[PDB]
């Protein structure tokens, strides 16, 4: 029934999804500015130019966090505000903005959980191949050093990357996210340079830190289940598990890249010399798990790599964009606790999208999102009972925001955002979370 008294209860955002103010105070151009302003890439013709205007309205966001009784806020720093050319001089005005925002959070009793990279690579670095270049890993570590020097007196909990699988595979292989390339070899090279950048940044941050820091990385993980016990379906499940999960977990854990996936990728695999793998396995203080969905895998030899297709389950609840399977959160946490060395663990993203509207009474009656939270929180209690060292939970998202290639049309907030007036309103699920947390 009860969570630990010191459990972290928060909500999460990312800079490009909320901030707007894309040309203000020296901000440079990111790959997502370029991508969202490319005709046809965003489903509804919107961009992050304004989004939630949280660059100006972060005080309102703090007011919402306080009204919800949260004790932490997970947000990202925009690299284009800090080093507008990607590699080059710092923009002190960008650092000062986040310094003030951190002070406002601390003044409100909210612990800042900062993500350094949540997908907004400076465009000048992409012009020089982006994550396809080792040099980008080096300059990412330089950016991490700069930020920790100025904010590390007040922020203890830092993550390097958010969801490198998305940045690499959606951005460079499937082309659905920025920068929009469609090449497997580039995607796999990007995955390696993201991990290398992570490892270099961890070392740089520890050297630059004014106090001991708690440094993690945030991974999206998908528990995978074979559709049947046939050799073909089991192998498809293992391949998909390798494609999403083990490709990142194993090198972070000092186990190299998984051999079965190296064999499967063949010549497309990156050239990983042992010096890189040692750097990638820099010791971490925590791991963040982003969980939305499972994969029930059926062999699909004709389909594209990794030749595994999802078997939809029509009996399970579905949201606006995903299947709901709360038990998969328990499964993946038990697997991490038993099979991998990372601890403690935080749930750094969990939430759902719905076709939310403001009702006649003024509220947003998002019962499915309340049920979503209730079901996933119950699975966390089961995991804690099994001894999983879970230390906090972050709802995705504090407010409806710019949802990448879906634009403003996919609402994940516990607070509703009117994108015309920028008013925020707490949804019913947000009041449920408030009251649940207060009971803890
Ligand atoms: C986790 O997934 C949500 C929903 O797709 C995104 O909005 C976040 O940026 C991502 F980190």
């Amino acid at each position: 029934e009860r969570f630990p008294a010191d459990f972290v209860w928060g909500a999460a955002t990312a800079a490009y999804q909320i901030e707007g103010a894309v040309r203000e105070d020296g901000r440079g151009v990111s790959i997502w500015d370029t991508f969202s302003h490319t005709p046809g890439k965003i489903a509804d013709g919107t961009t992050g130019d304004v989004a939630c205007d949280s660059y100006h309205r972060y005080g309102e966001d703090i007011g919402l966090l306080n009204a919800l009784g949260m004790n932490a806020y997970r947000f990202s720093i925009a690299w284009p505000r800090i080093v507008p050319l990607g590699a080059g001089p710092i923009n002190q005005a960008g650092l000062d903005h986040y310094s003030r925002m951190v002070d406002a959070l601390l003044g409100a009793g909210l612990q800042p959980f900062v993500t350094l990279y949540h997908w907004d690579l400076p465009q000048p670095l992409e012009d020089r191949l982006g994550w396809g270049s080792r040099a980008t890993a080096t300059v990412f570590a330089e950016y991490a050093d700069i930020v920790v020097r100025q904010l590390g007196d007040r922020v203890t909990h830092w993550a390097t990357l958010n969801e490198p699988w998305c940045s690499a595979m959606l951005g460079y292989y499937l082309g659905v996210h920025a920068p929009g390339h469609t090449d497997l070899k580039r995607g796999l090279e990007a995955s390696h340079n993201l991990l290398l950048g992570h490892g270099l940044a961890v070392q740089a941050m520890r050297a630059a830190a004014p106090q001991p820091l708690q440094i993690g990385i945030v991974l999206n993980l998908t528990p995978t289940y074979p559709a049947s016990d046939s050799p073909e379906d089991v192998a498809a499940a293992r391949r998909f598990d390798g494609f999403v999960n083990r490709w990142f977990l194993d090198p972070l854990a000092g186990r190299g890249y998984p051999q079965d996936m190296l064999d499967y990728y063949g010549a497309a695999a990156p050239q990983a010399n042992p010096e890189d793998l040692t750097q990638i396995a820099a010791p971490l203080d925590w791991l963040g798990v982003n969980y939305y969905e499972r994969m029930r895998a059926v062999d699909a030899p004709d389909a594209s790599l990794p030749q595994a297709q999802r078997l939809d389950d029509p009996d399970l609840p579905h949201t606006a964009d995903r299947e709901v399977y709360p038990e998969g959160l328990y499964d993946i946490l038990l697997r991490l606790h038993n099979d991998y060395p990372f601890r403690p663990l935080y749930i750094t993203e969990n939430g759902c999208a719905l076709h939310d509207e403001i009702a006649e009474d003024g509220g947003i009656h998002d019962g499915q999102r309340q049920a979503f939270f209730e079901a996933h929180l119950a699975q966390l209690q089961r995991a804690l009972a099994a001894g999983v060292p879970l230390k906090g939970y972050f709802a995705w998202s504090l407010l409806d925001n710019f949802e990448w290639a879906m634009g403003l049309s996919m609402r994940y907030g516990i607070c509703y955002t009117n994108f015309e007036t920028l008013e925020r309103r707490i949804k019913d699920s947000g009041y449920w979370l408030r009251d649940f947390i207060a009971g803890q």
Side-chain angles (χ1 to χ4, degrees):
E1 343 180 11
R2 253 184 220 277
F3 284 79
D6 66 335
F7 203 72
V8 167
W9 293 107
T13 62
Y16 189 76
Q17 303 189 257
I18 67 167
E19 281 183 359
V22 289
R23 292 161 289 264
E24 301 223 349
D25 295 330
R27 184 176 175 277
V29 177
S30 87
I31 60 172
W32 273 96
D33 300 84
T34 302
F35 191 77
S36 69
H37 282 269
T38 300
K41 295 301 181 182
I42 311 302
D44 65 359
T46 64
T47 71
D49 283 3
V50 176
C52 307
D53 197 33
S54 292
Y55 188 77
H56 296 111
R57 300 182 192 240
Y58 64 85
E60 294 185 42
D61 299 347
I62 289 174
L64 296 168
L65 290 155
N66 179 74
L68 297 163
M70 303 278 191
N71 63 27
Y73 182 36
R74 174 168 183 260
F75 65 98
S76 81
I77 289 179
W79 188 354
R81 293 193 191 284
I82 307 309
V83 191
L85 296 170
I90 75 175
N91 176 33
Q92 188 61 47
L95 286 162
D96 291 344
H97 168 80
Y98 290 110
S99 188
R100 289 186 293 267
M101 182 187 166
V102 161
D103 286 346
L105 287 166
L106 291 170
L110 300 158
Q111 180 175 356
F113 267 69
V114 175
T115 310
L116 286 168
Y117 185 74
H118 202 133
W119 303 355
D120 44 347
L121 186 72
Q123 181 71 47
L125 296 177
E126 178 59 30
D127 294 342
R128 297 151 177 77
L129 298 179
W131 292 108
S133 172
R134 284 179 79 87
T136 299
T138 292
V139 304
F140 175 66
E142 295 174 2
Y143 155 67
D145 174 304
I146 288 151
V147 177
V148 159
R149 280 181 197 282
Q150 301 213 12
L151 299 180
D153 62 328
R154 285 159 291 159
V155 179
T156 54
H157 285 66
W158 295 85
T160 54
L161 307 179
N162 179 85
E163 302 185 350
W165 181 94
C166 289
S167 293
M169 303 301 175
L170 303 182
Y172 291 87
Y173 167 46
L174 299 170
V176 298
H177 282 184
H181 298 300
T182 51
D183 190 273
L184 175 65
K185 191 179 193 344
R186 293 183 63 93
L188 290 170
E189 169 85 353
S191 77
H192 182 73
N193 292 324
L194 282 154
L195 286 171
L196 180 62
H198 158 80
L200 293 176
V202 174
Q203 286 196 52
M205 294 161 72
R206 299 222 192 260
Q211 65 177 320
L213 303 178
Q214 300 298 306
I215 305 172
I217 190 171
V218 170
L219 299 179
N220 57 298
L221 299 171
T222 301
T224 305
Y225 309 85
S228 76
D229 74 354
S230 74
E232 296 74 26
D233 289 338
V234 175
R238 294 189 187 109
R239 283 195 306 277
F240 191 89
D241 179 68
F243 175 54
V244 180
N245 306 316
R246 297 181 288 114
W247 190 254
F248 294 92
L249 288 167
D250 281 7
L252 292 165
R255 302 178 187 172
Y257 287 107
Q259 189 62 55
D260 65 321
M261 297 307 301
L262 287 173
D263 294 342
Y264 178 71
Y265 290 144
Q271 321 274 60
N273 63 50
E275 196 117 313
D276 285 1
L277 294 166
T278 300
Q279 214 93 268
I280 289 168
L284 296 182
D285 306 297
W286 58 273
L287 176 76
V289 177
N290 287 5
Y291 177 78
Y292 285 140
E293 62 193 27
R294 65 160 183 184
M295 171 63 163
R296 183 175 61 160
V298 79
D299 186 40
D302 303 333
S304 66
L305 161 157
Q307 291 162 297
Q309 273 184 4
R310 158 179 280 94
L311 196 69
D312 294 325
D313 192 333
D315 303 322
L316 291 179
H318 291 61
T319 71
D321 61 349
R322 301 191 195 273
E323 182 193 56
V324 179
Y325 189 67
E327 294 83 356
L329 181 54
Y330 172 86
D331 291 340
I332 200 70
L333 291 171
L334 205 63
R335 176 189 185 182
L336 289 168
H337 173 55
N338 284 331
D339 301 358
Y340 285 92
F342 313 109
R343 55 208 65 244
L345 302 175
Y346 288 86
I347 304 305
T348 39
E349 188 200 60
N350 182 235
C352 64
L354 300 172
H355 294 114
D356 295 310
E357 68 187 344
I358 296 170
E360 176 69 19
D361 58 276
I364 300 89
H365 309 309
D366 60 334
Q368 292 164 101
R369 183 174 292 110
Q370 178 185 310
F372 184 98
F373 287 131
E374 192 165 8
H376 287 82
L377 291 174
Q379 297 299 322
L380 301 182
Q381 274 292 336
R382 294 183 58 224
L384 283 161
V388 175
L390 190 67
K391 288 261 188 248
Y393 178 82
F394 293 86
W396 186 268
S397 184
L398 177 62
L399 72 177
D400 299 331
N401 62 51
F402 179 81
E403 178 52 31
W404 306 119
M406 302 302 313
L408 299 177
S409 291
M410 193 66 69
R411 290 181 181 275
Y412 274 94
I414 64 179
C415 302
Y416 184 94
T417 309
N418 181 320
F419 293 113
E420 207 165 34
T421 68
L422 301 163
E423 182 187 351
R424 299 101 152 94
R425 203 172 294 201
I426 300 170
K427 304 182 186 170
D428 288 353
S429 67
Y431 291 116
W432 184 88
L433 277 171
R434 175 194 72 183
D435 293 345
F436 181 82
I437 292 167
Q440 306 290 326

